[PDB]
Amino acid sequence: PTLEWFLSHCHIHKYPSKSTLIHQGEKAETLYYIVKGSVAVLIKDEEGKEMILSYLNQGDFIGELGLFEEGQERSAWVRAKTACEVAEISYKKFRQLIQVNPDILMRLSAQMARRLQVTSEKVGNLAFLDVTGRIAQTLLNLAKQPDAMTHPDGMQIKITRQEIGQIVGCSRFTVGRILKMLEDQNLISAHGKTIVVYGTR
Amino acid sequence: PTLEWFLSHCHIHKYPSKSTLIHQGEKAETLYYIVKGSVAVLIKDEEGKEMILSYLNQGDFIGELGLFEEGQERSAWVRAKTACEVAEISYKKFRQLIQVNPDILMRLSAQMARRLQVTSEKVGNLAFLDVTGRIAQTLLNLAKQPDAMTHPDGMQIKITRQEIGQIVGCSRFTVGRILKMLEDQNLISAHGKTIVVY
DNA sequence: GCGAAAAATGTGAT
DNA sequence: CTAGATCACATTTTTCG
DNA sequence: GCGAAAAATGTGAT
DNA sequence: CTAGATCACATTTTTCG
Numbered sequence: 291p292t293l294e295w296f297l298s299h300c301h302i303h304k305y306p307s308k309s310t311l312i313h314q315g316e317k318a319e320t321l322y323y324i325v326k327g328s329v330a331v332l333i334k335d336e337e338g339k340e341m342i343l344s345y346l347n348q349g350d351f352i353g354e355l356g357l358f359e360e361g362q363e364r365s366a367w368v369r370a371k372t373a374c375e376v377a378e379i380s381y382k383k384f385r386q387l388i389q390v391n392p393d394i395l396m397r398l399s400a401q402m403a404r405r406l407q408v409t410s411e412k413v414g415n416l417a418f419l420d421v422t423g424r425i426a427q428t429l430l431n432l433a434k435q436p437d438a439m440t441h442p443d444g445m446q447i448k449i450t451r452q453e454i455g456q457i458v459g460c461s462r463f464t465v466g467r468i469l470k471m472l473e474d475q476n477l478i479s480a481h482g483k484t485i486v487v488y489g490t491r
Numbered sequence: 492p493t494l495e496w497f498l499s500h501c502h503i504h505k506y507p508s509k510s511t512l513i514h515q516g517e518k519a520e521t522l523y524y525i526v527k528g529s530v531a532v533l534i535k536d537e538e539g540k541e542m543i544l545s546y547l548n549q550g551d552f553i554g555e556l557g558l559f560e561e562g563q564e565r566s567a568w569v570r571a572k573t574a575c576e577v578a579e580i581s582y583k584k585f586r587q588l589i590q591v592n593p594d595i596l597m598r599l600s601a602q603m604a605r606r607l608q609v610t611s612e613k614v615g616n617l618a619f620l621d622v623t624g625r626i627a628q629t630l631l632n633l634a635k636q637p638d639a640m641t642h643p644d645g646m647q648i649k650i651t652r653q654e655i656g657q658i659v660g661c662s663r664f665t666v667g668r669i670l671k672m673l674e675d676q677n678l679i680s681a682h683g684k685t686i687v688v689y
Numbered sequence: 690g691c692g693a694a695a696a697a698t699g700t701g702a703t
Numbered sequence: 704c705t706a707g708a709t710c711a712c713a714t715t716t717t718t719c720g
Numbered sequence: 721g722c723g724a725a726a727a728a729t730g731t732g733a734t
Numbered sequence: 735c736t737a738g739a740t741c742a743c744a745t746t747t748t749t750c751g
């Protein structure tokens with residue numbers, strides 16, 4: 291579409307697993323674009339604990355936040371969850387594709403619109419729903435987005451308790467017991483893969 | 492220029508000191524613009540308590556997140572914080588607007604970006620910081636927004652314990668003593684009008 | 690600028 | 704009053720060559 | 721079908 | 735091991751007409 295026009299002005303790079311693509315801080319001047327692969331977008335505290343503040347996937351743009359204002363620091367980290375093919379353009383160039391065909395600035399904005407929405411829920415269920423709650427709708431969203439083996443009938447994602455814990459913002463230790471005694475209610479399953487939607491005990 | 496152009500095309504309405512300007516649950520119709528005043532995006536707890544996610548003042552944008560797909564159920568209530576003068580246009584009558592001019596595709600999108608930046612922060616401060624902490628940062632932010640009135644020392648900011656508890660996410664009892672602690676440590680005063688000696 | 694009616698809020702032990 | 708954190712060390716899963 | 725390093729777990733009383 | 739929360743009606747500070 292239009293997106294193959296913008297995509298052609300873009301050096302196509304592969305990254306390894308666990309590479310960093312962006313650090314919080316770094317000069318913001320390149321607007322990326324995931325061609326293949328998935329990506330976790332974090333933030334971290336000077337003391338150390340981090341948070342997962344979204345996943346992103348094919349056709350998701352990255353580094354979008356700089357572009358509207360000049361010279362600002364990258365707002366979060368992003369580390370390839372797995373091997374990605376990411377493209378890239380300078381902002382100085384991007385804004386040109388824009389004033390040469392304005393549909394891509396549509397493509398882009400709708401991205402951060404769903405994003406402003408999903409994020410405002412995330413604030414909402416940190417001030418409201420306790421761990422068990424926060425944990426619950428999480429495994430839920432973790433099947434409306436790819437890796438959910440319909441164990442035959444019913445999801446089976448893999449994500450480690452430590453990870454869930456890093457989505458929710460609760461100790462790895464709490465994410466153990468709650469997830470555990472969550473199968474007590476016959477609602478869940480275990481090992482590393484969580485087979486959601488049914489469960490057992 | 493656009494902010495006076497599109498401003499021509501729109502339709503100015505006054506809303507009093509408290510009208511519930513937009514409502515969650517609902518349907519993405521008009522795209523609004525604060526011609527005068529400020530606003531209080533607040534979402535709602537399971538049943539009951541609000542949490543302010545933002546304020547948006549003179550010249551910010553409301554209900555844009557409707558714009559780029561369709562049938563989108565409105566995202567959070569937006570209640571005026573005072574007599575703010577909303578100048579409404581139209582989604583349908585925005586797209587047309589948007590191709591005789593990309594400049595305001597831009598500005599709306601710039602606001603969109605600024606907001607996901609500070610929203611990302613909230614998600615960070617709620618999980619990376621203790622309550623007194625969120626209370627300290629907040630008074631810092633509010634003293635750094637327009638209604639704040641410069642004072643001989645610091646910035647004062649007419650607000651109330653119930654509302655910091657809100658914005659923060661903690662019992663108004665707990666906003667109660669923290670404010671009296673930092674009171675004693677000279678970092679802040681109160682009387683409804685808390686002066687942030689900072 | 691006014692005061693009645695309305696909204697803010699603080700005690701602590703668990 | 705009550706949920707969630709924190710602690711060490713061995714225990715398990717899980718990795719991949 | 722491999723098999724020990726590695727990364728992930730669970731105690732449990734406070 | 736501890737961080738906030740909490741539930742009443744007296745006094746205070748704030749509203750709007």
Ligand SMILES: Nc1ncnc2c1ncn2[C@@H]1O[C@@H]2COP(=O)(O)O[C@H]2[C@H]1O
Nearest residue numbers: 331344352353354355364365366409611
């Ligand atoms: N709230 C968010 N949700 C998801 N992704 C985000 C969020 N905030 C930032 N990002 C992404 O992570 C990137 C980190 O640096 P940037 O500010 O360029 O761009 C950011 C976005 O692309």
Ligand SMILES: Nc1ncnc2c1ncn2[C@@H]1O[C@@H]2COP(=O)(O)O[C@H]2[C@H]1O
Nearest residue numbers: 410545553554555556557565566567610
């Ligand atoms: N996180 C946020 N920060 C600021 N404003 C927001 C946020 N979430 C929603 N809004 C505003 O509140 C409105 C809710 O419904 P809309 O989707 O019409 O458009 C929304 C935004 O303009």
